[PDB]
Design a protein around this ligand. Structure first.
Ligand SMILES: [Mg+2]
Ligand SMILES: [Mg+2]
Ligand SMILES: [Mg+2]
Ligand SMILES: [Mg+2]
Ligand SMILES: [Mg+2]
Ligand SMILES: [Mg+2]
Ligand SMILES: [Mg+2]
Ligand SMILES: [Mg+2]
Ligand SMILES: [Mg+2]
Ligand SMILES: [Mg+2]
Ligand SMILES: [Mg+2]
Ligand SMILES: [Mg+2]
Ligand SMILES: [Mg+2]
Ligand SMILES: [Mg+2]
Ligand SMILES: [Mg+2]
Ligand SMILES: [Mg+2]
Ligand SMILES: [Mg+2]
Ligand SMILES: [Mg+2]
Ligand SMILES: [Mg+2]
Ligand SMILES: [Mg+2]
Ligand SMILES: [Mg+2]
Ligand SMILES: [Mg+2]
Ligand SMILES: [Mg+2]
Ligand SMILES: [Mg+2]
Ligand SMILES: [Mg+2]
Ligand SMILES: [Mg+2]
Ligand SMILES: [Mg+2]
Ligand SMILES: [Mg+2]
Ligand SMILES: [Mg+2]
Ligand SMILES: [Mg+2]
Ligand SMILES: [Mg+2]
Ligand SMILES: [Mg+2]
Ligand SMILES: [Mg+2]
Ligand SMILES: [Mg+2]
Ligand SMILES: [Mg+2]
Ligand SMILES: [Mg+2]
Ligand SMILES: [Mg+2]
Ligand SMILES: [Mg+2]
Ligand SMILES: [Mg+2]
Ligand SMILES: [Mg+2]
Ligand SMILES: [Mg+2]
Ligand SMILES: [Mg+2]
Ligand SMILES: [Mg+2]
Ligand SMILES: [Mg+2]
Ligand SMILES: [Mg+2]
Ligand SMILES: [Mg+2]
Ligand SMILES: [Mg+2]
Ligand SMILES: [Mg+2]
Ligand SMILES: [Mg+2]
Lengths: 95, 239, 158, 14
RNA sequence: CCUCCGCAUAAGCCUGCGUCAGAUUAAAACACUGAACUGACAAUUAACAGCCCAAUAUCUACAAUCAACCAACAAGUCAUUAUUACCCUCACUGUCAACCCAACACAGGCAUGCUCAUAAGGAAAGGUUAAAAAAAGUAAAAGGAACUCGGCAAAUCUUACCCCGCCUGUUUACCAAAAACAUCACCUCUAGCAUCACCAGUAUUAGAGGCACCGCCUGCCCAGUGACACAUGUUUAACGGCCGCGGUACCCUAACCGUGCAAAGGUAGCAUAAUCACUUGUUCCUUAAAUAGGGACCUGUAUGAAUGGCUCCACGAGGGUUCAGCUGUCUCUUACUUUUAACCAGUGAAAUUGACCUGCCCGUGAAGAGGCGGGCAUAACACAGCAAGACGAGAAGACCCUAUGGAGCUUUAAUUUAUUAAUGCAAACAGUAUACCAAACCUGCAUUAAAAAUUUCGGUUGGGGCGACCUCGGAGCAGAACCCAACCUCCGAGCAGUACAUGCUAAGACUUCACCAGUCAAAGCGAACCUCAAUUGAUCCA
RNA sequence: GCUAAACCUAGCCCCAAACCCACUCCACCUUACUACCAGACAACCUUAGCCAAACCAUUUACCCAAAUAAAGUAUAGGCGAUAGAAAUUGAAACCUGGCGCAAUAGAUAUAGUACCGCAAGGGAAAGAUGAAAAAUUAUAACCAAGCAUAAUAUAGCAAGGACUAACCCCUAUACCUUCUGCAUAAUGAAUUAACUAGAAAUAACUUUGCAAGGAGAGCCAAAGCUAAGACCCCCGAAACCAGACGAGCUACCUAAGAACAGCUAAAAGAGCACACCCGUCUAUGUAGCAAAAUAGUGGGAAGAUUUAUAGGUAGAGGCGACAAACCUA
């Protein structure tokens, strides 16, 4: 991911991670199950509904996605009409 | 690569000029034609291939006289210096040409056919149908280029109105203008295909290296081609 | 001298292709110089000449960054010198034609001291400046006798 | 093939 | 005593065995003092070969080889004329040597003349003794190749037979010098022709290819490739190919017929051969004894007619055998001389070295112990010879295997024609009664035969290729929660017989030992009141 | 105590400032280090390649306009390993050193010297007494690897336990590593002296400071922000391109020359055989005379033979009587 560039000497990110995932401010990444739009005629409606759900990642996957990004993608955005605004902060956490 | 040609003589003379061998070397120096190199030293003779040519302050026909028949190593046939007037020029010898012969170099085309011998030269417009000719030209006042080897000869076929079709030794027809001067008869030094080489020493003396020793697989061009006769090529310019 | 892909796609082979313009050996006629020249002209040049209404206008209006040729700059400099020096172009016995030619090309008229340095390269300019600033070294005897006569006049008139 | 290495001569100062 | 040497010319740094002092130290493989030196002294003087030629036009076909007979073929190494202007003259480079190229004072190499041994030039030996071993020389009672795979040094002087190649020659400089490449004879294809080789040539020529003389001959084919005509064809001395079965009277080896295919179903010749294993073939000879050699046979199912088949005139440092005569290779070795060997005088290595106070047997260990266990063995130190061991010295093995590390060759493995010749289109010129003709030279698009700009060649394989497999489920190994492999032994699956509420949300769990994936379901709105075991496909893009 | 150990100066690297130079006379474009004579032709051109994506065919900062935040954002990319701006607030003239070194360090340098090839090119150590060397004095010695002074004395990985004394008595299988297992007969080593091998981001841990704000503009924030400390090796291949060099050995060609006694000479790309061209075999050595030699047995030696001189054909090639043979061991 180029830890040191040749012009600015900073850290670069992977645009695939940004285009395929979505990081929340709490420290979770929202992904999408693969194969949710291809070959839907041989799958049961239960599987079709399960594939169309925002599934969270794990620990090592979240750590990898954080290491592949810089400090810009780990901030807090205040959009006007953000459907994921209620998922930024995570309450009722006891270790 | 300082490669300069030995053809540095813009004036016709009689003394044999020394020639330099090449061995397949052009101006760059790389071998481009294989099979040439290493031979006996030879001297070049300035051979005048143009038969009819007027002298200084001359225009009409002139007589000649064969002196002595020699040999030319630069070609297969032999040459013979023929004197006449106040100059001597080398011309190609013909069959049955010895010392003390008399030949004519005319140009006035006649109404009827002239029954010339096999030594003199006359334009194709005065020669009978079916005559063994040699050293035929292509353009009026250009020079003899076709049929110049040893024993090669051509036979007149037909006449139209201003052309003359000449049968080439390759059984191919070729027409030319009527005002072209061509010799009559066959070239001397016959029986050349019977020259048994006997040993590679003769080929090394002539200046021919042996062929390549690589085994080349014959492609599709090694088969016999039974092809018809190509059409007659015309040199007469028509507007 | 650029590069062209195979079937107009970047997922193939990158080949190199060099385009060449078309050359038509034509013949023109300059009215300012009154002499015909054989120039292997192309098509865009002919179009620009037709749009500029003649060859002299196309040469005098286009700047140095448009001709991209030394002959064009030489022709421009020659026309400028001919229009500035007012030298007889054709010949006497008919000055009306020369007057009309000079009046047709009157929207420029570059002075003589500036038209001689139009189109020249750096080496040619240096050579011209050296030839103008040549001047054989004057003997010091003249300067010495001048200083001497000046000093004697200054000491005598006082 | 015919493998062979050429010897190396030292400078004439030692 | 040798002279297989030397003197000059040619090439080559130019002072490199003349004197003087130092010669204490420093280079002689040791010394004197000097071909492996420090400083000073000056050699070589040209007549030797060079340093060269005032122009304008023109002239130069009857070789050399004692050149006089003769005789040729590879057709050849030497010459002037008319005119104009020019009467100043001897300058320059080296003349030494014991010498050059190979790291050297190297048993290597160097072109021509001179007497081919002389009038040039040098010393195989430092001394002491005669150890073993090795190398170079003379011969030997009897056998003369009986030893060795093979006549392998050697001296006598040596005949015949077979294969291969026509011959001379040349090729792997530095392990193969050959049957290997070439050579005249033959055959195939291409080209109607003027300036830079081809060629200052003309279809008895030139270029591109296959075998390689003389004697007998080259029988067939365009279904497949290429080439030529675009007339569906021609080409094979162009790439290549010329059957099987059944019936066949006593025995292999058949006359003949039927059947299916196709261009023909092996022609001539020759041989168990340089010729797949059977093959040490029948048999004769050469020896008393012969897979060695010659002669007549093809089931040669894999010889074969220019990938040419066989004898023949001559020949081969090519590969094999033998006859009359002889060489210690042997039975069975020996007599002498030199190099060399042992000691004395000095210069004086290279490979190699973890340290050694370093014996043997049995047994054990990373599987072959002088260093481990039990025994045997033992005052110490040098010289002179052999190899049994220390898996001894030289090359990170050239043989086997791995590598998403390379390179060479050939394509009908992949991107493409970047450069030609042919094409069709568009612009560029000019005539032409609503039509045709598109010449020479530039530009862009797409195609065809040669070059090419780049690349890779998957995995397990009781070492690798060949044998077998590449995804998933079930039965025993794994027996009663769960998981567990094998190139352990078996069934299978890449789907189906019928309604689309096979609609939308939403607590809780299992999870093929991780992840990506898959499955069950509380309840509500909506509606009348799902079967089988594996049964399959993600990112990008469209 | 012999061999041999230390003695600091030519200076060496980067900053700030400053823009730095080029004939005493002769010779220097032909055989440079040459005084003197008749065709004037000579440049104007996408660089490529390695590596990476575990291959590789698209792609891979290097492009010569001062900082930073934006921002590694939109974008380009077999949409993947990677590459990467712009719009925008902005960027305080002048001061002479080394928390670098001292000959195996620092430029290779006292020097681009010797040496290697025809050639481009490669290319290394040097110098230590002293105020008075016009003080040739008497001292300053003492430490590593090699030696004598002063050899060995039976037994054993060289060591330990020990006693009045070295041995004698008992125990005990060198060092690091790929390896389950190594002193194993696997790898490395003769010693001494000098030199040589863990360089760093997002995210983490600890400690000061401030605080709903922290921070010397930009950034973050539902207890946060700033600063400091802490951390990620060396050497070793075959391959490819670009710019220049070679036919003086060897392959081929070109111009002018030279060489071959004697006998049989059948007329001859005939035979034996001198000098000469090449080397089929035996024996000698493989750190030799020699990084390819020594005698004969060898083939040719009137021609497809050898050789002195000069020139040309060079790597995406030259040449080739085709050995993938040769192109300076
Ligand atoms: Mg031929
Ligand atoms: Mg051949
Ligand atoms: Mg002399
Ligand atoms: Mg040597
Ligand atoms: Mg003498
Ligand atoms: Mg002696
Ligand atoms: Mg001796
Ligand atoms: Mg005897
Ligand atoms: Mg025997
Ligand atoms: Mg013998
Ligand atoms: Mg032969
Ligand atoms: Mg050899
Ligand atoms: Mg040779
Ligand atoms: Mg040999
Ligand atoms: Mg042959
Ligand atoms: Mg045939
Ligand atoms: Mg057989
Ligand atoms: Mg025998
Ligand atoms: Mg021979
Ligand atoms: Mg001694
Ligand atoms: Mg052990
Ligand atoms: Mg044992
Ligand atoms: Mg041992
Ligand atoms: Mg190895
Ligand atoms: Mg692999
Ligand atoms: Mg690879
Ligand atoms: Mg590669
Ligand atoms: Mg390559
Ligand atoms: Mg494998
Ligand atoms: Mg196996
Ligand atoms: Mg699980
Ligand atoms: Mg329900
Ligand atoms: Mg890579
Ligand atoms: Mg900007
Ligand atoms: Mg230094
Ligand atoms: Mg240095
Ligand atoms: Mg010591
Ligand atoms: Mg003991
Ligand atoms: Mg260590
Ligand atoms: Mg290892
Ligand atoms: Mg092992
Ligand atoms: Mg060991
Ligand atoms: Mg090993
Ligand atoms: Mg060792
Ligand atoms: Mg040469
Ligand atoms: Mg040759
Ligand atoms: Mg002969
Ligand atoms: Mg002979
Ligand atoms: Mg071959």
């Amino acid at each position: 991911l180029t830890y040191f560039s040749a012009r600015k000497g900073k850290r670069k990110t992977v645009k695939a991670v940004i285009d395929r995932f979505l990081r929340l401010h709490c420290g979770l990444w929202v992904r999408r199950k693969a194969g949710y739009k291809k070959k839907l005629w041989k799958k049961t409606p239960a599987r079709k509904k399960r594939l169309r759900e925002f599934v969270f990642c794990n620990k090592t996957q979240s750590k990898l996605l954080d290491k592949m990004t810089t400090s810009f993608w780990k901030r807090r955005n205040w959009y006007v009409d953000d459907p994921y605004q209620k998922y930024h902060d995570r309450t009722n956490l006891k270790v | 690569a300082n490669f300069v040609s030995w053809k540095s003589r813009t004036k016709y003379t009689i003394t044999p000029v020394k020639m330099r061998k090449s061995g397949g070397r052009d101006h760059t120096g790389r071998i481009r034609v294989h099979g040439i190199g290493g031979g006996h030293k030879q001297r070049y003779r300035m051979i005048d291939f143009l038969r009819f040519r007027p002298e200084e302050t001359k225009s009409g026909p002139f007589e000649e006289k064969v002196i002595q028949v020699r040999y030319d190593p630069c070609r297969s046939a032999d040459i013979a210096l023929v004197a006449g007037g106040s100059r001597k020029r080398w011309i190609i010898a013909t069959e049955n040409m010895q010392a003390g012969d008399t030949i004519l170099n005319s140009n006035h085309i006649g109404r009827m056919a002239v029954a010339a011998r096999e030594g003199d030269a006359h334009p194709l417009g005065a020669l009978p149908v079916g005559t063994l000719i040699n050293n035929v030209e292509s353009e009026p006042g250009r020079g003899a280029q076709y049929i110049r080897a040893a024993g090669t000869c051509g036979v007149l076929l037909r006449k139209v109105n201003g052309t003359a079709i000449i049968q080439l030794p390759s059984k191919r027809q070729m027409q030319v203008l009527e005002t072209c001067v061509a010799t009559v008869g066959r070239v001397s030094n016959v029986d050349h295909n019977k020259r048994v080489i006997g040993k590679a020493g003769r080929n090394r003396w002539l200046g021919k290296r042996p062929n390549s020793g690589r085994w080349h697989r014959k492609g599709g061009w090694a088969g016999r081609k039974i092809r018809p006769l190509p059409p007659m090529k015309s040199y007469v310019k028509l507007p | 001298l650029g590069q062209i892909y195979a079937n107009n796609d970047k997922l193939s082979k990158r080949l190199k292709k060099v385009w060449k313009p078309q050359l038509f050996e034509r013949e023109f006629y300059s009215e300012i110089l009154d002499k015909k020249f054989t120039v292997t002209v192309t098509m865009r040049t002919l179009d620009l000449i037709d749009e500029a209404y003649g060859l002299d206008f196309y040469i005098l209006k286009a700047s140095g960054e448009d001709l991209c040729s030394k002959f064009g700059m030489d022709l421009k400099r020659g026309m400028l010198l001919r229009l500035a020096r007012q030298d007889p172009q054709l010949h006497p016995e008919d000055p009306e034609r020369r007057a009309a030619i000079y009046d047709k090309y009157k929207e420029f008229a570059i002075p003589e001291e500036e038209a001689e340095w139009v189109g020249l390269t750096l080496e040619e300019a240096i050579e011209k400046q050296r030839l103008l600033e040549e001047k054989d070294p004057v003997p010091l005897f003249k300067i010495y006798v001048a200083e001497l006569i000046q000093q004697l006049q200054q000491q005598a008139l006082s | 093939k015919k493998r062979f290495t050429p010897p190396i001569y030292q400078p004439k100062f030692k």
